[PDB]
Swiss-Prot record:
Protein name per UniProt: Proliferation-associated protein 2G4
Phosphoserine PTM positions: 327, 353
Origin organism lineage: Eukaryota, Metazoa, Chordata, Craniata, Vertebrata
GO biological process: negative regulation of apoptotic process; negative regulation of DNA-templated transcription; positive regulation of cell differentiation; regulation of translation; rRNA processing
Gene name of this polypeptide: PA2G4
Keyword Repressor: yes
Family matches, as Pfam families: Peptidase_M24 (PF00557)
Role: May play a role in a ERBB3-regulated signal transduction pathway. Seems be involved in growth regulation. Acts a corepressor of the androgen receptor (AR) and is regulated by the ERBB3 ligand neuregulin-1/heregulin (HRG). Inhibits transcription of some E2F1-regulated promoters, probably by recruiting histone acetylase (HAT) activity. Binds RNA. Associates with 28S, 18S and 5.8S mature rRNAs, several rRNA precursors and probably U3 small nucleolar RNA. May be involved in regulation of intermediate and late steps of rRNA processing. May be involved in ribosome assembly.
Species whose genome carries this gene: Homo sapiens (Human)
GO cellular component, one term: cytoplasm
Amino acid sequence: QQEQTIAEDLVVTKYKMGGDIANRVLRSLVEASSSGVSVLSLCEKGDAMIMEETGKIFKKEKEMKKGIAFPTSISVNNCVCHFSPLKSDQDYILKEGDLVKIDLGVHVDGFIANVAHTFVVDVAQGTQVTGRKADVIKAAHLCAEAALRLVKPGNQNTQVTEAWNKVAHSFNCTPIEGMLSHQLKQHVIDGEKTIIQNPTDQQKKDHEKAEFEVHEVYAVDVLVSSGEGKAKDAGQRTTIYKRDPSKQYGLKMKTSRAFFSEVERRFDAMPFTLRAFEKKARMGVVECAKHELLQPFNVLYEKEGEFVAQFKFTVLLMPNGPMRITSGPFEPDLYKSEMEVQDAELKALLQSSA
């Protein structure tokens, strides 16, 4: 009963302002991406820009929390998600032709605006991206377009799941199995109401069918692969975590207890990167993650040589229709695929207005 929702104009404003910041920071990072650029540097730049820009709004409200909802993550080629290296980790240096996914989130007073975008590094003027890179990027963006049209009051999450499989297969691509798009609420990045990608038979049973409703907010997250779509851990150090306020445990080590306290104060229940702490965080993390006080956002990979594309946007289900508050700077004429959507209903859906 105490929820602040988009029924309130002020709440819509807070979402829109966080969305404007997310959009601006994303575009800055895309422009800063060129051959030879350090992924660590881009992650640090993104996060700092989020803090600086949120610092400049609602200045008179000195107690209002605002800042990072999802730390800047830059996941290249077959890397799926959540790459945000520690200073001590192996960095990654961008190469011409790399496929890059930038994923980040901003919050204003707990209202979250998440965005992610895919592009290719240093595409030359007057050329197009072709091949499997083009296939997977076009597939992922058409999945995003389909979701923009289908995530509306009265529709079912299952409709989205089905459409995504049809679109992706049109390009001989596969949405990554089991990945979720969450409803957002104030202070809640991971609402239990979700859209699931390409669920296994077991995932279909464990996942709840649901109907979208007016005043709900979603961070729609499309991740599509040129390969089988069964993402796996590959020994990469997890750096992104979130506190889970539903779980409690009295920690045995003073370092763990103090780390717990610092996490709660600084981040509440927003995902954060360990780079925000490096040694003393590493030990505190161990006990907290072990007893489920922190949830990891692991770095997952598709098969070597394959490509994973992503588009994520946040949408407000307003009485007058869906209102998207974030998006990436997608240029369709850049991508040429041998394939196209052939399905009549799907083609109709994609040509219709959003």
